[PDB]
Amino acid sequence: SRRWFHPNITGVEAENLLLTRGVDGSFLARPSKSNPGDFTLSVRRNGAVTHIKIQNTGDYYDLYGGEKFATLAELVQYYMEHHGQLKEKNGDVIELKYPLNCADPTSERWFHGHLSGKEAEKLLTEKGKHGSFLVRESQSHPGDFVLSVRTGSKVTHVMIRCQELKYDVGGGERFDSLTDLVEHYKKNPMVETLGTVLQLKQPLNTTRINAAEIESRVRELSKGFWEEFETLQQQECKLLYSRKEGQRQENKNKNRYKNILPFDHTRVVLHSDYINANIIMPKSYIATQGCLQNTVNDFWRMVFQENSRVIVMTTKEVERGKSKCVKYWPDEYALKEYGVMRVRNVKESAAHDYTLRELKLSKVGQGNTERTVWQYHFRTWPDHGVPSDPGGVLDFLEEVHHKQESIMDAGPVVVHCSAGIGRTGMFIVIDILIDIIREKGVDCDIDVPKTIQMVRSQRSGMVQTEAQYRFIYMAVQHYIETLQ
What topology is assigned to 108-203 in CATH? Answer: SHC Adaptor Protein (3.30.505)
Question: Is 421 within any annotated ligand binding site?
Answer: yes
Torsion region of 313: left, alpha or beta (phi above 0 gives left; psi -120 to 50 gives alpha): beta
The CATH number that domain 204-484 falls under is: 3.90.190.10
- In 32-154 the beta strands, taken as DSSP E runs, fall at 39-45, 48-56, 61-63, 68-69, 98-99, 133-137, 145-150
- Rounded to whole angstroms, the maximal C-alpha distance in the chain is 79
Q: Is-contact 394 357, C-beta < 8 A?
A: no
Question: Is 420 within any annotated ligand binding site?
Answer: yes
DSSP-derived letter for residue 407 is S
| Angle separating helix axes 423-440 and 391-406, nearest 10 degrees | 70
Give residues with Cβ within 8 angstroms of 20, minimum separation 6: none
Q: Is-contact 300 343, C-beta < 8 A?
A: yes
Q: Strand, coil or helix: what is 311?
A: strand
Resolution in angstroms comes to: 2.4
What is the number of H-type helices and E-type strands within the chain?
Answer: 11, 25
Domain extent listing, the chain: 1-107, 108-203, 204-484
Question: Is 309 within any annotated ligand binding site?
Answer: no
Q: CA of 281: how far to CAs of 16, 223, 341, in Å?
A: 45, 33, 27
Q: Which residues are catalytic?
A: 417
Question: Is 339 within any annotated ligand binding site?
Answer: no
Separation of alpha carbons 111 and 234, rounded Å: 12
Question: Is 417 within any annotated ligand binding site?
Answer: yes
108-203 and 1-107 share a CATH fold: yes
60-87 b/e with 16+ CB inside 10 Å = b? bbbbeebbbbbbbbbbbbbbbeeeeebe
Separation of alpha carbons 110 and 203, rounded Å: 4
The CATH number that domain 1-107 falls under is: 3.30.505.10
Question: Is 148 within any annotated ligand binding site?
Answer: no
Q: Is-contact 132 124, C-beta < 8 A?
A: yes
